[PDB]
């Protein structure tokens, strides 16, 4: 009774003192929402699972998973989203696999993309630090952890580098994403860790044209962890974000399914999911409007409209 | 003399204080007119009997009467009228008898009609409350009182629900109509109670094509009670409102009967009542113009023209 | 000399003060013309004798004379003229003698004619007052004075009624004509009093087809009194107005008689009076043009052309 | 030398000042031409002698001469010419000799001719004044001066009348011609005075069919005086104007005499004068064309062609 | 350790005392930058090699080198730059080779250029002194050392003159440049000595249109000596300064080479070096903006923008 | 050595004592400048030759020379200059030759000019004395010496008069100029004596439009004597002062000759001397600005600008 009031008073005061003393995000409740500066992953479901609506800026991010699970796709979409915000992006490459026609399809502006193919793991982290320290680079993607071979071996690395790097990152608000194939110092320094995997084939006839994808946020220091997103990745197209908008939009009653049609605000979008997705692809301002309504319904920060 | 002046002064001051203290409509004179936000019943005669020109918005309405007397017809017309105003409508159904071809003939837009077929009487009133609380539903029809069986029985309900519901209704201006076949808590919470019954057959040859209908306003908190309306309900067509317009229009000298013809503003409408009704059906803007003149002559608020 | 100037100055100033104090028309000179809103009697000669070109609107008119002298004819023509102006007319009948084929021949539109056959003299004047008070009736004919029997007798009337009626008439600009067969309160309230009588037969062979008619304006408050008009009334046709136009037109040099022909503006109208009258009947716009020239020559207001 | 220049400068300036001060026509040179609104006399030779091509409008004209010299003929032709211009004419007759078959032969439209046969000389001049004052009469012929007997005698007249009449004539542009048989006040008020006389017989066999006629302009205030015209007047036909056109036309080289033929513009008109005159009578538009060329050659204003 | 701190303390204090006692620039470190009032040489590379961004004002300058190496070009550009600053310039000529079409192409305003062709070496230095002493001449070019023949010979000079001249120069802030063909007193008095030579031909086909040029700063009292600049001199155009801006701009990452294009601030300048140079020639405010960014990157004072 | 120092010390002390004892101007060096209250002669060259920039105020001036050499011109210009200073002027005339259109062209305000034509030489000097003694006349011109005939002769004069007059002149600061045609007492009392003569014709075609003029200051007590001025006097225009400004201005480097143009402060004045003179005439404030710079360069006091 007064026991319960006394107990809730004490919990609140402790939670507040913990946040003051150890920093925001140090203790959360598992289903907490958010009251934030983020860059979209290009997946609405993943932006929602992240709680703040995207990857947090000025932080270290790790994305790991088996090859062809969607890691590079997610980072190229993040680059395209950051470029849309007006930000400058760099790709530090130790894998030599980038396909720039694909990057372009995902919205990356290659004219403005910085690229580095470093001579060693040391050199990769030092170049990464130099770009962070410039104060003029907004997002860096490092591909990939394992490939970051020490000079001695070519003829604790991660750990001292990450110490130096995180120092720089905190001063300049640069976002840095490491792609890791499936390293340990990363586990503590990262504010967000994503576990991505293929969960099924998508097929046209017996031609596979894509993959069902699951991403789990296994570490999240800016909103509660362990949320998941499920979306399609289509060959040549990346995340089917328009599909997410229709699915989540209909689920949360923003978008109507009227017989065979998807409709929004009393107007038809398309007959069947493929037609409706294509219409949203052709009408990106409408797509963004609907997306933002879905974000608001779920308590997730909006993206830029306009 | 001065006795009479003193007496009239005292009556007026008491009536004014009663209205201030107990609310408008608490004491009226039986033939009072009105100085109001209403939705039409689809019957001109009933809108006139209601005094304010329709059902009052933000209030509870009860419509009761024997089966096939016209209750569902009146509520579907009210839905069509509310949709014409731009309002969102819901039908909460415990009778499983709705005919949507008929609803469409009466002008209901099924695309925009919310529908619920609840699992119990409790569930019906809770869903009704949730829709009222949304602030986004303008009119709810609940069919029907008796059918609202308590969960325990399936395996005071009305009374506590109506307490909660009327609280919500007053905050959001939602209109809620209960259809009752021939419950007690309704008698006090309802601002308007309608008693509807069939009073005769309408025939083509020996084929009955409709029914003469009488509606009595047995409770009216927004204008004086106990007025009545008489109109035809035709199978497949609902209230013969064009017939009411010609009848009341001619009665109150707005519409002329010139020999065999009905005429308005010096122009023929049709030869005989059937032809004139059909012409008004084909010329709804004229029908509304004449209807509104009749309303004005009787001291009843107008509907939207245009 | 200066005596004459002083005397004319004094007369003028008195006449002006009398008009200001007692109202226009209170003192006139017997051959005064006019500087007016009127409705034609259907007789050009009578419209001229009235000075203002017709009966004055917003006033009481009395027309009296022996039966079959032309009273009803004059009032039906006045109705037809008022309807031509767009005005609404009523006939209050205590004589039960109206012939509506004749009324139609005289140009009355029966569709728009209000009719009343009152239960008593009181009822006649009360209905007359109600029509005046509507503000929507332009001309009322009351037939006839003597027939207006008091209720008590059926089982001062005129006088108190005329007091009330003239009050209403002055507010609404309604014209009211009383037909009187040959009452006293009428003598003062009437602005115009007409004395009409038959003065001779008109014959085809030994078949009488009409009557020579004399109307004397015995009271005139809107222009000088005691002028007279002489015209034919033909069975089935009313006043021979085309005959008046030719006669007065030729008299005042507007219309030419060239040998056997009547001519206007250098063009033949017809050979002999009957042919010329028929031509004007067939060419009413020409008839009106010539009529208006005659009115202008005599200092009488014009009618509508077009 | 400079004497001559100084003298011509002074003369011109005086002539200009005289015209400004005393009016146009006050001083002229005897052979002056003209730079005018006129009505033809029906004689080309006389229209030329008048300088302005006809009698001046808005002026008083006197025509005097022995009986049968051609006075009435000239005035009837002037009437016919004025009617051709669209003007309204009046004949004020104290002689009782008019032959209207002759007037018609000369082109007078009797339908439009006003006629007066006054009771006295006074009455004649007063009617003349009233017609002038109308502003609607273009030409008045008064026949004849001597016959204008004073009332007293029947049981200075001309002089006070002419004062009043000339006042009216100047305001309204009416032309007034007085025929005088062979009065003194006329000598000064008239702008033009014509002296007409027979100078010889015209014969067919020993049948006289006409008369050689001489007209002298003894007073002319609109162009120089004392010019003369000589022409034939034929019984029943008036002035032989076609003969004048051929004579003056050939004299001034407009018309050719080719052997026995008269020709104009390279085309034969007729063999011998009689045939050529008749052809011009039958072809009045050609006659007018040739007449106007002759007028132009002589510096005389043209008539209407068409 | 503390040995090193003690040693660095002592060096700094000595360097500071040397500067105070012998003057700024007396001891420098070879790669020192600068913390200055300068006039541009018209070569960005040479302005950079000079450290302060141009020739120092209020000082003596020597420029020496073989004929046609670019000496006169550099001094005419310095004149044009000084005139751009609003300064008054003089050219003292003992060589008689000036081409003023070329001077104009290089931006010299001939209207404001003072010119002297002295009678002897003595007279040249005395006129130079008089111009310096005026306090109204900002830059003097003396062409050329060897040609400055003593009067006695025409029928130590430099040394006593330079003593007097440097006294005047220090009081008035006049800049004086001596052109020397390849004198000894100059070696000590000069604050800056430039060694310029042709190092190669520039060709269009087999037509030589210019020369590769090297300038070495062999003496520099205002910033460290022995730096070098390499640039093109084109016949008729002088130093290719726009070429320097593109080269140094791209080298120091201010200007982008994107495929075949040079670009700055995200906007194309031109396809290939010639087109980009011409664009900068046509857009001098942009050229200056880019030049100044390059200066800032290298630690060199800026020029006036605007 | 010390001989030279002793000698220069002695000279200076003697010169200083001579000035104290005999008055300023008693001993000068021939090329001395000046350290003064003056009125301009209207000639810049003459104002410069006078050393103090004009005639000295409060002194006697003699101007002598052959007729038409420019004496009257110089005195009328002096009057115009004195009036410009706000001073009151008088002209005492024994020659009767003054042309006041010319005086006006030279800038004399005739409204304010006092004039006297005395009866004798005695009377002239007595009136001159009375005007001086008023304390209210600033400049008096006496024309002319020879014409100043003694009364006895009409039926030593100069000498006793000049004694009295110079006494008055010294008290009141009046300037008095005597014009003398080519008297002895004048030679000593005058502070300034001018010898003016024509030295050549100025011609347009073979029309002489003016005269080259030389003025020598043969006596000067306020600055060194014997300086000369040469200027044009143009018929109707007086001294060509704008021409002097351009000539002396260009000579002393204030005004530029740039090709065919005269220019000042970088702005064109006119193409050729005539155009430049006219521009300065139209822009008197500029003319004065340039004139004053020339005066300052020569060590001569300035005139009022503004
Ligand atoms: N160049 C490309 N063109 C078209 N689609 C591509 C391309 N690369 C990848 N994809 C799509 O994205 C899916 C995952 O590829 P992605 O490179 O994003 O994963 P990854 O984990 O970075 O791969 P890896 O480990 O092989 O370097 C692929 O299965 C394919 O459907
Ligand atoms: N589906 C329909 N099609 C055509 N006409 C109908 C239909 N339903 C009702 N009507 C007309 O309206 C009349 C009354 O029906 P309505 O359903 O409005 O009354 P109710 O009181 O709600 O009925 P119940 O009590 O049977 O559910 C009927 O007699 C019929 O004439
Ligand atoms: N029904 C009719 N048809 C044709 N002509 C008619 C008719 N009624 C009247 N007239 C003509 O008009 C004349 C006068 O009739 P009117 O009714 O105008 O006079 P009244 O004074 O109103 O008559 P009463 O006193 O008989 O009611 C008649 O003599 C007749 O020539
Ligand atoms: N009625 C006529 N019919 C034919 N020709 C006529 C007629 N009247 C006149 N003429 C011709 O005109 C000539 C002159 O007649 P006119 O009447 O013009 O002269 P007048 O001076 O007015 O005559 P009077 O003085 O006789 O009244 C006659 O000689 C005749 O040739
Ligand atoms: N009059 C000119 N027109 C065009 N280009 C010129 C001209 N003079 C010089 N140049 C260009 O500049 C280069 C060097 O000439 P400049 O006179 O600047 O050198 P310099 O050392 O002063 O010459 P010199 O020693 O011959 O007097 C030439 O090779 C030529 O390309
Ligand atoms: N009235 C005038 N109009 C125009 N120019 C004149 C006039 N008077 C003099 N000048 C110009 O000035 C010149 C000298 O005249 P000015 O009268 O100044 O000399 P002066 O020595 O006083 O003459 P004088 O001895 O004849 O009285 C003349 O040659 C003429 O060019
Ligand atoms: Ca809808
Ligand atoms: Ca009607
Ligand atoms: Ca006619
Ligand atoms: Ca770019
Ligand atoms: Ca004054
Ligand atoms: Ca210049």
Numbering used by the authors:
A (entry chain A), B (entry chain A), C (entry chain A), D (entry chain A), E (entry chain A), F (entry chain A): 6 to 40, 44 to 163, 176 to 202, 219 to 342
Can you list sentences taken from the study reporting this PDB entry?
RecA protein catalyzes strand exchange reaction between single-strand DNA (ssDNA) and homologous double-strand DNA (dsDNA) molecules, and also induces the expression of DNA repair proteins in response to DNA damage through a regulatory network known as the SOS response. In the present study, we report a functional and structural characterization of a RecA protein from Herbaspirillum seropedicae SmR1 (HsRecA), an endophytic bacterium capable of fixing nitrogen under ammonium and oxygen limiting conditions. As seen in RecA protein structures from other bacterial species, the tertiary structure of HsRecA can be subdivided into three domains: a small N-terminal domain (NTD), a central core ATPase domain, and a large C-terminal domain (CTD). The HsRecA protein forms filaments on ssDNA, and promotes ATP hydrolysis and DNA strand exchange as do other bacterial RecA proteins.
